[PDB]
């Protein structure tokens, strides 16, 4: 019924093995005179409503570095947007939420190695990043082939 | 890293640094100023490190 049998040893030797790249884009938006988004590693204290993934793979500038293995739901771009502060200045020792998280997580079903990170400026002069992820896909039961 | 700064001219003024006499006993010299010299581009650290700044 249109199936086929493949040699496992040929697969081990590199038959029909391929390479997969996926790129992610993000940029800093401008909402007003002085309301800008920032690429940064958000902290559990100064930001609220963080993603459930892990932020420990981000660098100081909020961007992951190439060569780092990533898994699903990991944060590859760290971005925060400002929020008007609440009355928490009552008795909080500077530990009050002023920013909201807008980070970009890796897709839940995908994982791989960070291949190349690009940082530049858009037409408007704001920061603009692109992250490319690389993985290898080996043939297995269910993959589609054709003559 | 900093020779092309506009303020570097006044920054380097009066500084004391180790100098290769060449004629080698290293000695200290006092910077009386700097003077850009066109056409005297020289390798600073590598081949690509062309520099026109000169230290008097």
């Amino acid at each position: 019924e249109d199936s086929m049998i493949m040699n496992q040893s040929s697969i081990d030797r590199g038959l029909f093995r391929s390479l997969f790249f996926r790129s992610y884009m993000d940029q800093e938006k401008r909402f007003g005179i002085s309301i800008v988004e920032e690429f940064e590693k958000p902290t559990r204290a100064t930001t609220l409503r963080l993603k459930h993934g892990t932020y420990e793979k981000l660098d100081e500038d909020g961007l992951i570095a190439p060569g780092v293995r990533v898994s699903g739901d990991d944060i590859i771009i760290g971005k925060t947007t400002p929020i008007p502060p609440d009355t928490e200045e009552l008795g909080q020792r500077t530990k009050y939420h002023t920013k909201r998280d807008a980070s970009t997580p890796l897709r839940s079903t995908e994982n791989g190695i960070v291949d190349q990170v690009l940082l530049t400026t858009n037409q408007e002069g704001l920061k603009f990043v692109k992250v490319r992820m690389r993985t290898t896909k080996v043939p297995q039961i269910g993959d589609k082939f054709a003559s | 890293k900093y020779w092309y700064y506009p303020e570097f001219d006044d920054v380097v003024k009066g500084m004391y640094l180790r100098l290769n006499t060449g004629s080698s006993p290293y000695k200290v010299v006092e910077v009386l100023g700097s003077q850009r010299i066109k056409g005297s581009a020289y390798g600073l650290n590598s081949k690509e490190n062309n520099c026109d700044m000169y230290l008097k």
Partner: protein, 263 residues
């Protein structure tokens, strides 16, 4: 009762004829040589720098496939059976590769001869990548241009071809019996005449063709098997054959011990 007769012998391939053995024994020997003789192959790659145009895992896959000399792999232990923390010298061999291109013109080829054995078991002849001669550069691994460098450290472990095809010592085992089809084990497709439409086997001269008036013999069994064992250079042909026999013996002895200890 079993007999062996060698036709051609070389360091890399032996062509021999088995006789007075069952077909099952010959096939089990072929399967054991193909996928159950332990060899040594690179199993971990630590990439300290790779600025070449090839992906890191591309080069890792290429490295894993390079055959390494596995003569004394019997003395070596399996990685999972070594009580040492991390890897010691008795369960792993460490090779290191460092390649670089100097100058602003030309292309540098990275060959398997550049793999340098750093550490391994004492006085055991294992780990060195296989070379055809003293002047053979070996397997082409990568190519580099100016300011591209490859600096890696590879660890070789002992395993069998069941786990991954890179540990297989043999390339292809030709296997053949009954060139003249006296046993009628196959029925020959044809258009006009089946005799002149099918090429003769390469061992057809080693057996007398059936007589025109001969009747079918229902009491006969396959008795003589012709098989050629080709190796990748990690093990010699005689070593592959002998170690396949020894592996089969060990498997049967393990079954026997299990039976005797079951009671």
């Amino acid at each position: 009762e079993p007999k062996v007769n060698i036709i051609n012998a070389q360091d890399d391939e032996v062509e021999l004829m088995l006789s007075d053995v069952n077909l099952s024994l010959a096939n089990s020997l072929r399967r054991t040589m193909l996928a159950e003789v332990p060899t040594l192959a690179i199993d971990l790659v630590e990439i300290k720098m790779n600025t070449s145009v090839l992906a890191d895992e591309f080069i890792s896959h290429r490295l894993g496939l390079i055959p390494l000399v596995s003569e004394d792999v019997e003395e070596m232990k399996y990685s999972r059976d070594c009580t040492c923390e991390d890897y010691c010298d008795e369960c792993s061999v460490v090779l290191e590769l460092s390649a670089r291109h100097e100058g602003e013109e030309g292309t540098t080829d990275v060959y398997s001869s550049s793999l340098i054995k750093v550490s391994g078991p004492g006085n055991l002849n294992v780990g060195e990548p296989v070379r055809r001669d003293d002047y053979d550069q070996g397997i082409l691994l990568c190519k580099l241009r100016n300011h591209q460098e490859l600096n890696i450290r590879c660890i070789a472990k002992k395993g069998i071809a069941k786990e991954h095809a890179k540990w297989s010592p043999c390339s292809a085992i030709a296997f053949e019996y009954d060139p003249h089809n006296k046993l009628k084990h196959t029925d020959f497709w044809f258009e006009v005449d089946a005799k002149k439409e099918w090429p003769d086997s390469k061992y057809a001269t080693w057996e007398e063709p059936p007589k025109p008036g001969e009747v079918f013999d229902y009491k006969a069994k396959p008795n003589r098997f012709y098989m050629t064992v080709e190796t990748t250079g990690s093990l010699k042909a005689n070593q592959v054959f002998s170690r396949g026999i020894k592996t089969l013996q060990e498997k049967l002895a393990n079954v026997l011990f299990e039976l005797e200890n079951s009671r």
